[PDB]
Structure 1
């Protein structure tokens, strides 16, 4: 009777008595107390912890009837708890898993592509790369028979892609820059006459310029219309400031307005001419800027002149104690993104925004308020470009380092490993593909061309191809390069040969890929020379860490691909070498903590016509 007037509340059970009175029992699932005046419950705010709190405080959503778990935020995947009431709230809990299209096989990569996980917080998280022996954009992969990253045919990405889609213009000769001067679809590298003027390039004194008459005023054998110094002998055509007028006929070769002979750094632009120590070598080119040293002698090839050079480097990252922004913790790259003098490695706040490294959703970009308005766990201020060097993550070979984004050996140090007086045959390095391909031309002394970028953890690969039948000697590459007495080297001999100098020690150089760590008590010279050639250990010189026991030599005119994995933090090293698509050498895991990082470089020891093509390095920290 009494319940007929609905004095209670929608859903709430009204109990009616014989005398007309009533009482209100339940409040319907998900509501407050008092059966008469009833209100909505917050299952979220003050009960359990139903939803997946992505390093934050939000996430669970309270509705007027019931409650709501947000869908798993980007980079994650799970279920989405929906509940009517309160006993449904302690039971049922949101599990969100960290996504990984590589391990989850949800990727869109080609059968002959590898899905590569870029790391949880990367933009994007994964990419597609064609496997060795193939080329493309990762979605489509075709045969790449010389491993120079350009496929043998035009592929169905030849319209939508920048690189690796379009007929390799020298199908059988590594030429990762695909330079084709006359544009006749035959690349410079295999083209017989590069400028289509009828003079074959071996005879042509202006190889990349049309000049059929061959006019050569001075007999420097570099013809008129390409000679940067037409009236002055200069076969190297060196042009320091790449202005079109070569050094030979320039009174100011670096274009800095201070004339040569006045210039205290004749090769390096320095209008300001500052010379702190007064030694006549300006700071910009002074390898010992604080200490008098006009001769600039640098006997161990680390860019620190003999006079500053004390080798005291207690953490083995190759920067000495007095020149190390983290003297005690290895950090070969010396990264210091906030520029406060404390290296990323020892500094607990790398951008100086108050939010410490471990708790910062944009570790390298200033953002105290940690705005992440799409919920992807990354501050929106570093959305595609973690290190803020304006190169997006996907195109950045070192996405957590603003000093490096491109594989580039365009500028390199020549490190001569056995300098002398006449037998001095220097390596000749020619650079193509904007620093991503080097060809060594000469049957030369041991020598390295080492790039200037520095690495802790690193992956480094490159195409190895010897474009001649002559000789059977060494080529390869270095990593963790610190000084000419401190590097790891991978080198590769064709035929086993004992070195033609029995002094100072007999060196027997076996065929096969050799992984070695140089730790020389003498530095450059005959002792290290021989030790480098020798397969095995040489006390006070070289220690061989691995060498292919099958002893397989490289073949003439044959494309190989090496892949170095180096993780100095543990000491992990892995060297893979590929012939075409098939692995042909694998060191397996190696462990060596002699050097906790350093630079990369290419290596020759008495082998000419060596192509180091389609070079790539990446930071893997």
Structure 2
């Protein structure tokens, strides 16, 4: 009777009584609950927590009737609850899983490519890379038999990709720089005449310049047209300041105005000529800037002069106590991004923005308000370049390190492991591929060319190839280099041969890939030399950590890929060696914590014409 006049909020049940009076009971599950006047319920706030929070707070939206979860944010995948009502809210809860296109097998990498997970917060979260033996952009991979990252033919990958998709100009000889000076499609490395001037480039005194007459004023055997000091003798053509004018014929080799003899750092540009300790050697080239030492002797080759050098490095990261910005905690790269003097590794706020590391969506880039206006768990300020060194995550070999972005051995320290008088034949390094390929030429004393970038966790991989048939001795690479008495080395001999110096101790070098660690109590010299050559332990010198029990040696003219894995925090070390696309050797997991990181470098011991091609190092915690 009285319920005909719809007096109860729509959705509510209207009870009508015999005397025309009525009562409002229900409220449409989703509304407050007076009966007649009924308002919207907030299933979200002040009730449960049934939407997935991205480490933020605002994930549940409230609607007029009912409620609505927000779809899992970027980097996540899952359901998206929708409900009208109050009992629909306690039951049903949003579940988001962290994406992983590799382990999810949802990527689109070539059948001969690898899906490589780049880390949860990485931009992007993954990439495709062609496997050893192949080359391309990752969506398309072709044959790469010399393992230099360039394939044998152009691929449909050609015009929409920068590298790795154009025909290798020396299909059988590693030349990952692909330098082809005369542009005749035959690359320099395998070109009989690199300038097409008709003078075969072994007899050409200007390999990379046209000059058929071979005009050579001074007979330093570097023709006039390419000679940077055409009138003075200078076969090495060294040009410190790289201005076309060679050191030889220059009164200022480093172009800092301060003339050579006056210059207290003649090889290093320094106009203020500061000489704190007054030893005649300027700060920018003093390996002991606070301590007197004109001679600058550095017997363990760690770039710290003997007078400074006390070797006391209590956390084995290779930086001695008085020079380690985290004296007690291992940090070989000494990364200190906010420059406050307190090393990242022992610093709770790496960018000094107020928000500590373990709660910061841009750990390296100052941003106290944590703008993440797209909900990807990463601050929009460090959107594509987590370390803000202007090189983006995908192209960054150390995405969480503003001091490394590219593999670059262009500047390297030459570490002689057995120096003497004559009979001292030093290695000879040629640089190509802007520092990503080195060739050792001579039959030399043991030696390393160590690069300067420093690492903790690291992956180091290179192509190994001996472009000659003379000899059967050692090559390889060092890692964790700290001093010439402290480093991990991987070396590989072709034919087992006992070293030709009985003294100090006999050394039997077997064939196969070797993993050694060096803790030498004498430093560079005969004892260490033999110890390096010797397959096995040598007290106070070298400890072999693993050696391919099959003793397989390397073959001539044969491309190998090495891959180093090193995680000093735990001491994990793993060495892969590929022959073409097939794993030929694998150290399995190894454990050694002698050194908590350090530098990378390339190692030779009495083997000439050794090609270390297409080198890549990456930070694998960084």
CA deviations 1:16-62 (Å, max 9, x no partner) are 00000000011001100100000000000011100001101110010
CA deviations 1:232-251 (Å, max 9, x no partner) are 01000000000000000000
State how 1:209-248 maps to structure 2 within 5 Å. 209-248=209-248
Give SS of 1:46's match: coil
State how 1:265-414 maps to structure 2 within 5 Å. 265-414=265-414
1:608 aligns with 2:612: no
CA deviations 1:548-569 (Å, max 9, x no partner) are 0000000000000000000000
How far apart are the structure 2 equivalents of 1:554 and 1:256? 48
Give SS of 1:281's match: coil
Structure 1 partner of 2:253: 253
- How big is the shift at 1:544? 0.2
How far apart are the structure 2 equivalents of 1:312 and 1:9? 82
Give SS of 1:189's match: helix
Give SS of 1:345's match: helix
How far apart are the structure 2 equivalents of 1:341 and 1:285? 22
Give SS of 1:4's match: helix
- How big is the shift at 1:403? 0.1
Q: Which runs of 5+ in 2 are unaligned?
A: none
Give SS of 1:3's match: helix
Give SS of 1:478's match: strand
CA deviations 1:359-388 (Å, max 9, x no partner) are 000000000000000000000000000000
Q: Which runs of 5+ in 1 are unaligned?
A: none
- How big is the shift at 1:10? 1.0
How far apart are the structure 2 equivalents of 1:533 and 1:222? 37
- How big is the shift at 1:468? 0.2
How far apart are the structure 1 equivalents of 2:266 and 2:7? 98
How far apart are the structure 1 equivalents of 2:5 and 2:212? 110
How far apart are the structure 1 equivalents of 2:166 and 2:53? 48
- How big is the shift at 1:144? 0.2
Structure 1 partner of 2:97: 97
- How big is the shift at 1:164? 0.1
How far apart are the structure 2 equivalents of 1:163 and 1:257? 41
Provide the aligned C-alpha RMSD in A.
0.3
- How big is the shift at 1:580? 0.1
Give SS of 1:248's match: helix
How far apart are the structure 1 equivalents of 2:357 and 2:478? 32
How far apart are the structure 2 equivalents of 1:43 and 1:235? 82
Give SS of 1:234's match: coil
CA deviations 1:158-197 (Å, max 9, x no partner) are 1001100100000000000000000000000000000000
- How big is the shift at 1:273? 0.4
- How big is the shift at 1:93? 0.3
Give SS of 1:135's match: strand
CA deviations 1:185-239 (Å, max 9, x no partner) are 0000000000000000000000000000000000000000000000001000000
Number of aligned residue pairs? 621
1:124 aligns with 2:124: yes
- How big is the shift at 1:280? 0.6
How far apart are the structure 2 equivalents of 1:162 and 1:267? 36
- How big is the shift at 1:570? 0.2
CA deviations 1:65-96 (Å, max 9, x no partner) are 11000000000000000001010000000000
- How big is the shift at 1:118? 0.2
Give SS of 1:434's match: helix
How far apart are the structure 2 equivalents of 1:344 and 1:162? 35
How far apart are the structure 2 equivalents of 1:620 and 1:167? 31
Normalization by structure 1: what TM-score? 1.00
How far apart are the structure 2 equivalents of 1:338 and 1:589? 36
How far apart are the structure 1 equivalents of 2:4 and 2:606? 105
CA deviations 1:447-485 (Å, max 9, x no partner) are 000000000000000000000000000000000000000
Give SS of 1:44's match: coil
- How big is the shift at 1:439? 0.1
CA deviations 1:106-129 (Å, max 9, x no partner) are 001000000000000000000000
Normalization by structure 2: what TM-score? 1.00
CA deviations 1:251-273 (Å, max 9, x no partner) are 00001100001000000000110
How far apart are the structure 2 equivalents of 1:577 and 1:40? 67
Give SS of 1:577's match: strand
How far apart are the structure 2 equivalents of 1:143 and 1:520? 44
How far apart are the structure 2 equivalents of 1:195 and 1:10? 91
How far apart are the structure 2 equivalents of 1:34 and 1:22? 14
Give SS of 1:129's match: strand
- How big is the shift at 1:314? 0.3
1:176 aligns with 2:169: no
How far apart are the structure 1 equivalents of 2:366 and 2:92? 39
1:459 aligns with 2:459: yes
How far apart are the structure 1 equivalents of 2:268 and 2:14? 93
How far apart are the structure 2 equivalents of 1:5 and 1:419? 108
CA deviations 1:410-434 (Å, max 9, x no partner) are 0000000000010100000000000
How far apart are the structure 2 equivalents of 1:141 and 1:10? 65
How far apart are the structure 1 equivalents of 2:620 and 2:3? 72
State how 1:404-483 maps to structure 2 within 5 Å. 404-483=404-483
How far apart are the structure 1 equivalents of 2:332 and 2:102? 30
- How big is the shift at 1:344? 0.3
Query: Stretches of 4+ moved more than 2 A in 1?
Result: none
Give SS of 1:529's match: helix
How far apart are the structure 1 equivalents of 2:55 and 2:190? 57
Give SS of 1:322's match: helix
How far apart are the structure 1 equivalents of 2:562 and 2:501? 30
How far apart are the structure 2 equivalents of 1:427 and 1:560? 21
Give SS of 2:353's match: coil
Give SS of 1:448's match: strand
How far apart are the structure 1 equivalents of 2:575 and 2:295? 39
How far apart are the structure 2 equivalents of 1:545 and 1:430? 31
CA deviations 1:549-602 (Å, max 9, x no partner) are 000000000000000000000000000000000000000000000000000000
Give SS of 2:530's match: helix
How far apart are the structure 1 equivalents of 2:505 and 2:64? 87
